[PDB]
Design a binder for these strands. Sequence first.
RNA 1: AGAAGGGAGCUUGACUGCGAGACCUACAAGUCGAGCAGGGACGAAAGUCGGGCUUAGUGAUCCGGUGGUUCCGCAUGGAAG
RNA 2: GGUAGCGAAAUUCCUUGUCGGGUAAGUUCCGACCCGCACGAAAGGCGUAACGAUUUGGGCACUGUCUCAACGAGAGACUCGGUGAAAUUUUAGUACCUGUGAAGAUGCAGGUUACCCGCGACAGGACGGAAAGACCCCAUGGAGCUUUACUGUAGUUUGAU
RNA 3: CAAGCGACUGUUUAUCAAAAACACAGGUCUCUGCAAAAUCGUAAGAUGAAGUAUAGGGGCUGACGCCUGCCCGGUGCUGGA
RNA 4: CUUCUAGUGAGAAAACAACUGCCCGUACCGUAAACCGACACAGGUAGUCGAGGAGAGUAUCCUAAGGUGAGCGAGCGAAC
RNA 5: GUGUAGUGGUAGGAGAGCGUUCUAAGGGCGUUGAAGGUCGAUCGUGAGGACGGCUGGAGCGCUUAGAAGUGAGAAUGCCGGUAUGAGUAGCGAAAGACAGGUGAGAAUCCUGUCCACCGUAUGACUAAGGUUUCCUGGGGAAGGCUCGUCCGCCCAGGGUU
RNA 6: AUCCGGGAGUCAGACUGCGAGUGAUAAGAUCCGUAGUCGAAAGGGAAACAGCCCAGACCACCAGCUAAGGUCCCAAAAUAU
RNA 7: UAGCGGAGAAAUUCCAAACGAACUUGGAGAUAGCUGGUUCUCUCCGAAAUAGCUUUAGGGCUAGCCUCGGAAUUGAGAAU
RNA 8: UUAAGUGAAUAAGGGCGCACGGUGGAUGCCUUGGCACUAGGAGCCGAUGAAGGACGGGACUAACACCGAUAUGCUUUGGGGAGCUGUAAGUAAGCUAUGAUCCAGAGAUUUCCGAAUGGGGGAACCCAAUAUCUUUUAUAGGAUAUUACUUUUCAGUGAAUACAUAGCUGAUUAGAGGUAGACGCAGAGAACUGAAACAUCUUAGUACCUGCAGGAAGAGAAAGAAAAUUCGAUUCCCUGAGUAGCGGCGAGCGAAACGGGAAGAGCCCAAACCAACAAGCUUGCUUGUUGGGGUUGUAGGACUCCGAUAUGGUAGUCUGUUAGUAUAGUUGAAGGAUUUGGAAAAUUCCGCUAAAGAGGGUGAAAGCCCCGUAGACGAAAUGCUGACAACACCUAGGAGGAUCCUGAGUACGGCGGAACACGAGAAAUUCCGUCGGAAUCCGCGGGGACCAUCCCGCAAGGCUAAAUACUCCCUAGUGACCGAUAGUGAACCAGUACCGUGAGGGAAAGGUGAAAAGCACCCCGGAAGGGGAGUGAAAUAGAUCCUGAAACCGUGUGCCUACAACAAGUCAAAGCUCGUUAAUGAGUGAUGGCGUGCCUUUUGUAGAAUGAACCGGCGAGUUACGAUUGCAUGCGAGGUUAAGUCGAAGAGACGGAGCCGCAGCGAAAGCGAGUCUGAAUAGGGCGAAUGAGUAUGUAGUCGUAGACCCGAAACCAUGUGAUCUACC
Lengths: 154, 118
Amino acid sequence: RSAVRGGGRKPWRQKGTGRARQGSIRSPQWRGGGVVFGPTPRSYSYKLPKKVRRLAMKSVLSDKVAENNLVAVEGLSFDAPKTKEFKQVLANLSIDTKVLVVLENGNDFAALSARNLPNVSVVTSDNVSVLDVVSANKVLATQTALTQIEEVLA
Amino acid sequence: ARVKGGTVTRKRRKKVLKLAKGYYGSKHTLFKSAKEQVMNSYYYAFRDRRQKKRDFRKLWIARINAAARMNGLSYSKLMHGLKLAEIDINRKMLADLAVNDAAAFTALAEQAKDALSK
RNA sequence: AGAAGGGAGCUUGACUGCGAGACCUACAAGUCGAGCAGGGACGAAAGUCGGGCUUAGUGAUCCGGUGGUUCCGCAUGGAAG
RNA sequence: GGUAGCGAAAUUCCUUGUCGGGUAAGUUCCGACCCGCACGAAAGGCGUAACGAUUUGGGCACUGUCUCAACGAGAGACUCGGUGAAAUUUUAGUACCUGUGAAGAUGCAGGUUACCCGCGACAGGACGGAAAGACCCCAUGGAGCUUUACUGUAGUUUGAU
RNA sequence: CAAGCGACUGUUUAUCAAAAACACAGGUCUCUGCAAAAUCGUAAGAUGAAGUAUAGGGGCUGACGCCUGCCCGGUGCUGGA
RNA sequence: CUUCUAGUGAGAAAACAACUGCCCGUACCGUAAACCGACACAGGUAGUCGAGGAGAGUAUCCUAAGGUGAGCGAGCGAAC
RNA sequence: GUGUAGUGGUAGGAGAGCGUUCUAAGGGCGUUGAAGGUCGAUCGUGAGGACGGCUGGAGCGCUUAGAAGUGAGAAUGCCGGUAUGAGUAGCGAAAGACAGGUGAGAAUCCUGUCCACCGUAUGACUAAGGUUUCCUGGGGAAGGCUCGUCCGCCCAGGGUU
RNA sequence: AUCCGGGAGUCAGACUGCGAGUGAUAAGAUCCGUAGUCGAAAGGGAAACAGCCCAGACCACCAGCUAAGGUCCCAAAAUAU
RNA sequence: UAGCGGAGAAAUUCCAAACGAACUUGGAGAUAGCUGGUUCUCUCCGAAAUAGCUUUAGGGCUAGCCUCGGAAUUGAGAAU
RNA sequence: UUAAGUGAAUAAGGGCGCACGGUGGAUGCCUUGGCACUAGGAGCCGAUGAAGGACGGGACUAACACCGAUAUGCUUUGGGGAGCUGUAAGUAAGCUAUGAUCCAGAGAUUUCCGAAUGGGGGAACCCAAUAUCUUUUAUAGGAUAUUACUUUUCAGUGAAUACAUAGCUGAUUAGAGGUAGACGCAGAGAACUGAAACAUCUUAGUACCUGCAGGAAGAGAAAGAAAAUUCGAUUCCCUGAGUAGCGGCGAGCGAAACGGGAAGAGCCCAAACCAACAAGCUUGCUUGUUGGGGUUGUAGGACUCCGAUAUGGUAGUCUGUUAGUAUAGUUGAAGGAUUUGGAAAAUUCCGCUAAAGAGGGUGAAAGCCCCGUAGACGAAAUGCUGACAACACCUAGGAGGAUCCUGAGUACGGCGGAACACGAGAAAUUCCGUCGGAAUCCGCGGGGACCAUCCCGCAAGGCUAAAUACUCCCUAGUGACCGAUAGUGAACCAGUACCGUGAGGGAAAGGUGAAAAGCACCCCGGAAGGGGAGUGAAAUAGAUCCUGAAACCGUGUGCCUACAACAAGUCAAAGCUCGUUAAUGAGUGAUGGCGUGCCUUUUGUAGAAUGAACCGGCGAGUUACGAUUGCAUGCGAGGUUAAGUCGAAGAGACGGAGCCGCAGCGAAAGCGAGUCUGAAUAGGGCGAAUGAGUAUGUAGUCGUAGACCCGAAACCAUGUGAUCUACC
């Protein structure tokens, strides 16, 4: 009400016209008036106890291993980032469904071939989050990335 | 997040209307008065559904009156004798018999006459 | 009227710390109390006495005053408070 | 401790006071009387020529104001052609009596009257329409005004520096 | 033809009151010696006035005629030491 | 505008002839259908001129010069 | 299974559900017709849900969880459209008639004749004020309280020394 | 029934048997005690009718028994003994 | 000549149709123990109009009457 | 044939259902504009004439844009490589491979008003002076340049009054207005409201006015904080903490130090002294101006005496040299056929590419048609940011303590007011107005009245980057944000139309189809309008142009209605016409039974109490921060992070200052499973004896906030009005 470009001059008298009483052109009932209890800018974000985060990550990974979905590859290498080979890498490894790839560090020549059909998505070993694992079915990860994961996770 | 009011209301109102086909004037094209009319019709339907069962007794009773009285049995003494000779016909069947099967009705009236004669 | 009424002798319990348990009641309040300790009064003792035959004679809190006090006191010892 | 003057008055409750005049008949008017509820000398007392779209009583003249109405003219109203609003409005196939009821009913109850549709007139009723009572109370509501109500202050004055 | 009110010519609530209301000429008290009192403004500045007590402001009464009694205890004002 | 002096300070008058003269307003209505009133409104609008017969006269009655016939009508001839 | 028992209800406390928009993943439909609209004699205890016929022509369902500008018949509510009153009241003072034009069309425009109204003004000139309404030639959709070939209206050109 | 805790509405009542007050031993009056019903109660009877008499609807049926009150006709039942 | 004001031959009269104190914007979504309204559904239970105190009497607090979740002994509830 | 009795059918008009149109624009889908933010740039413009405007400029010119008498545009340097002369149809005129139009960077011209500045003024107008040059024989006419006010420097002139001082004249320096409706520093400073009234208090030093700025401002190098054991400029954030305090001790107001973090940074004067110049030359050595010397609490400096004459610095330049970047760009991978269509990107076969599967467009829905994206390259001109060059500037030890210096009407006292959480209170600390008035290192200030011992500092002179607040504007982005009654008031020629004298108030209005292919030709008609024929997949898509609901207005017809008192229905039901989501069917309805609308407020309603004319659309318990209880989850005598850093505006780890529980009683000293009161080991109040918490989600309630919405009469602060009316 106080933000609409309106005015504070009454429409007309309080009596006389027999009409109802009105205070301002701009007001909730009138067409083109302010809103009552409309949405304001807010936050929505909030954190948890520090232990349950770790319990969550552990639980997710144990669940995925519980059904033979972590496929541990020895080591991936490409001199040049040729997208086609990656497809063949999975074709040999028989992973066709929605998948997730975990890499060790800046051996980027193995990530620059992960703009595939969105069946794949790439991520290093410092950003493995909950969703980026739960949302997928199979997970590829080199042998060094496994140990690296087994470090940060204490 | 602004939820508009597209077509949540007409479904409801036009569902009310159809329940008011054939009302004696502008009580079938005014979504304010059709509703009150439907309400009162519901009240009346409920009450009278408990009267449909009243009348037919008074009706069968008058018919047993007419027919029976012709045999010299008042509409009481007939029922009394019947419930004394241990005969237990239901009024509805007695009315139907009195209207159609005069011979059988007279047979029953004879048995009753015999009954309270004791 | 076995007196709470009325005379007479001595006295100051018209005391300090209390209180099991009850009555009353929305609260805040008000009423009763056997009995323990200290220290006494009158009586030879037994015993009675924490005001007057019982029920009215009164006013939160905030603030100010007077006495006392093994309480506190902005670096410390005092003091103001 | 109210003099001169006035005195049922722009002031008198009892009150249509009492007597006289005016009218066939006068609580209003005019004259006189004092028992001034409660007149009074610059918030002036008592006379007064002229003046008043001022208030009050009585005559003459005149007349439809009246007994008591009648007739004539023009505009509206009425019929036909053209144009074309408004306030109001829960839905309505909207009778009368005596009851009954939030204590006066078109609509309830019991009776009586009543073929369907219009057109010109009247205004008893629809607690009729227009203004969310101007009378009255309340709001621990306002605003304007007074004072020897409370608290302050502009302003005027007094003393030290 | 008589009575009340008001002396008169004026003025008044645009839009429910035009009078017996206000004005009004005359009466009387009172203030003010000029940078006058008084008023507008914090002040400079202004009006009173290019005036000077036969002048200028304030209060009551309201042509004209005859008049205008008693009380200073109370409240103001002025004077007092 | 007329004069008098102080006054810088060749020799200007008048012949006649012939030339030069800047910007702004100018249509229309204007007791109205063109302005002020929401209207093509029975209201308001300052100034000049404003004729003839009688008649004191710009009063009244009919008229000159001059202008208008008004923005819904045709019938009937009741109540009110 | 089977017995026993209970099931009115305002302010109010408790519990379980229907529906709208959007986000996420999974799975789907769509020019061989989606959303939306209309009709149907269908299904569940409710809120509500399907199926088919016609219109329509580009996007929407279903499952699990999440977040809300999430549900309307009343505020003498606010905005738009349309009713009743009703073909009713009104058409804003003043005298016109005929002939002939003009034209798709005429009481309402042009022309003619007689009549009639004002004439200290309903006549002539100016100051404000208005701001192209002035003139010439075309037009008739809207304004003109009806009509209109006409206009202070619409279109085009041109006028203020 | 008691105790601890989370969440409220209510503070304008009415009439009718009974027993008392003020009133005039008047009021559909007013102010208390006690029981019911209405408020928050529909169905039957009292012609119609909140508060009187009878009785508390989860729902369906064109079955059966009774309460208050009734039995010539409107209107179901006895023109009963 | 201006609103804490102006002007008034004085009436609470006038100051752009409404003046016991002009209009317009801002504080401002002022305040209201007062009035009006507040949207989908079913199952379960279901009241009160009283006492006390109140610059209180149509408002409020606690108490009583209602509902929901737990603890514990009961034998405490009830009607004869 | 008489008589008695019974008695059907027809509609001036109306009701119900069905079927078809008309007006009106809800609803479905859609976007040409919005809203809230993120990262980065940028944070002033002006006497060289600003912001904002008036008038003009085109073949046609009413408007909007761009431009300015060089007017729909001039010059130059780079980009680009085929059409072009805006909105906007059309015609006439042309331009262009000798590289147009267009994009980007530099320049040139810029009418009139406006601080407006020669004078005047009702803004976009009028009239001047003086010099120079022009037209006509000359007069008039035309153009150019200069001419305001104040102050800061300098000359001259000057005079009541002599000397010189006002003053005047001339030259010279700087100002003067605007705003970004934001952020900052001050001067001045309210009322409604809460306290259930109201005076001290609060609302609040807020709203409004005015002055002064900056890209940031304000503060800043201890007369500090502390209280053993110390630390050493300022700002900002977490926690301390709703604590100590204040308060008609009422409603309410409410800190600071310690601790953890972000960013870091310190300098320059006065004085005492030393020299040169000038004056009184007291010729005593006083005055002054320069230049030198010196900047502090562990007291420092001067002053004397010796060493060295180095060594380290920058918060300066618009000075060069380089590197980067902002403003135009360039390059940029891979598809055919078949079935439905008017049209494929759809469907079915068979292929290909990807550092490119983000997005937008094409006749429906595209990795492979088009614009692009991932990559890779690129500047003649101009600007910024670095770096290192050069130049500018600044900075030395040790030892002595005889004498000198270390900020005056200042500190501080009385009085009266304000500022500190602190309302005079026992009131320290800080300011303002008035009066009184200190010492000089053996000295001074402070440690919350005041004194003593102790401890910590040196006022009355200046400057100072960063960490912090804001967004009119530009660039690129994002959103469990809106989708024409929403979102800005405004998606369209909007602060416009319109209303008011004036300040001021302020709307409604988007949608043809893929492409105008926007209906040639005939016919009725004055026209408008219509009927064929055509365009089109579809004209019921024909310009009122997608879909097209309801109130409201009509046409046709199956059933009923002219002896009937109807909250308008429901239960019962004859006949008449039908034939469905196929099931104890649909429509209508003679005749009988029964029956006083809906909402709110009330002891009570049909009320003759109160609201609705009807249909559609919008239109009310929410969110942030605290507190408490239930449910659930992770650890459990423990739980647990905050600010902040790296990270995609995420996750996702570090970060142990701090809070809560584990011990209570007492006002307090204190005591401790006990303690308080008391003479008491008495008794009594309160807790222990097993007794669990904490972090987060969620929901119910409460508190501060406008807190469920609408509704006054009034109050305070800047403005606008005497064209009506009142007086002059």
